[PDB]
Amino acid sequence: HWGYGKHNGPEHWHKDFPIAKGERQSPVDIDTHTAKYDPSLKPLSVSYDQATSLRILNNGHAFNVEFDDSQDKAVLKGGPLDGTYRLIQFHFHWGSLDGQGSEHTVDKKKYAAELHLVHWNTKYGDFGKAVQQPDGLAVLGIFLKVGSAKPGLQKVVDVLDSIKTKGKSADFTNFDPRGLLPESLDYWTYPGSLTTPPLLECVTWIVLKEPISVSSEQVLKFRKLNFNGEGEPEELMVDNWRPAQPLKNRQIKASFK
Ligand SMILES: Cc1ncc(-c2ccc(S(N)(=O)=O)cc2)o1
Ligand SMILES: Cc1ncc(-c2ccc(S(N)(=O)=O)cc2)o1
Ligand SMILES: [Zn+2]
């Protein structure tokens, strides 16, 4: 029953998920001047050449593009990470207006949307086991600003009408997530959590400094999705973002000077 409405939104989540008030919650504001350059941080290794997308699902909170993660086909390594993390899905969070929608903020700036590429640590064998571990997941976060279209996003945009409502899915094969990346892989990193219930504190966050540009028409199509199921009153899927949470006893590290 959690969601993003007045009656079930982020302010309510702690009542069923007490970890909502925990010590390593996400997202956070990235204060660029306080983040420390860490020269020991390695370049990120994004290896998506063998990615196998399978399906796109409206889950009532966002839409997930799901991948075959039964083998090491699309993996994230390097950066702050030890070992190999397999891509399981990506999704976005976005706003009702271009001035909001991102979960992380940068010097309090909100972007129009934020892409999360979710990966799990292969030493734990599957995703369900990984979320129970402090180093179980690595989520690569990428900001979206509104400007020029992102050509690699269009195949995603164009299928959304077929998954308008909660529980709908569609075949979504041969999608290359490399088309969603910016040019630079400079990043900030910090230990955090899932940003939706169950809010588990299992994520190494890697947030790219360079946003990608998407067109107004592209993001408008995100906003035509529904939180509700088919044959239910229409509630537009917008503002599905959690606001910044207290940093507490954490340091944000930068890969770049
Ligand atoms: C009107 C209404 N019926 C049930 C709920 C509700 C249930 C769980 C949550 S929570 N704590 O999971 O966010 C928030 C609200 O609201
Ligand atoms: C129970 C469950 N299965 C998958 C997830 C989940 C995955 C990523 C994120 S996020 N927004 O932190 O990338 C939030 C929740 O929740
Ligand atoms: Zn997310």
UniProtKB/Swiss-Prot annotation:
An example GO biological process term is: regulation of chloride transport
Q: Where is this site: Fine-tunes the proton-transfer properties of H-64?
A: 4, 59, 64
**Residues annotated as the enzyme's active site:** 61 (proton donor/acceptor)
Q: Which residues bind Zn(2+)?
A: 91, 93, 116
Pfam families in UniProt: Carb_anhydrase (PF00194)
Keywords of the record, alphabetical order, are:
Acetylation, Cell membrane, Cytoplasm, Disease variant, Lyase, Membrane, Metal-binding, Osteopetrosis, Phosphoprotein, Zinc
Look up what happens after changing residue 114 to Q. Strongly reduced activity and sulfonamide affinity
Q: Which InterPro entries match?
A: CA_dom, CA_dom_sf, Carbonic_anhydrase_a-class, Carbonic_anhydrase_a-class_CS
Q: Which GO terms describe its cellular component?
A: apical part of cell; cytoplasm; cytosol; extracellular exosome; myelin sheath; plasma membrane
Q: Which residues carry this modification: Phosphoserine?
A: 162, 169
Q: What class of enzyme is it?
A: lyase
Q: Where in the cell is it found?
A: Cytoplasm; Cell membrane
> Which residue ranges does the record assign to the Alpha-carbonic anhydrase domain?
1-256
Q: How is its activity regulated?
A: Activated by X-ray, histamine, L-adrenaline, L- and D-phenylalanine, L- and D-histidine, L-His-OMe and beta-Ala-His (carnosine).
A further note on this protein reads: Target of drugs used in treatments against glaucoma disorder and breast cancer.
Disease implicated: Osteopetrosis, autosomal recessive 3: A rare genetic disease characterized by abnormally dense bone, due to defective resorption of immature bone. Osteopetrosis occurs in two forms: a severe autosomal recessive form occurring in utero, infancy, or childhood, and a benign autosomal dominant form occurring in adolescence or adulthood. Recessive osteopetrosis commonly manifests in early infancy with macrocephaly, feeding difficulties, evolving blindness and deafness, bone marrow failure, severe anemia, and hepatosplenomegaly.
Identification of the protein by name: Carbonic anhydrase 2
Source organism of the structure: Homo sapiens (Human)
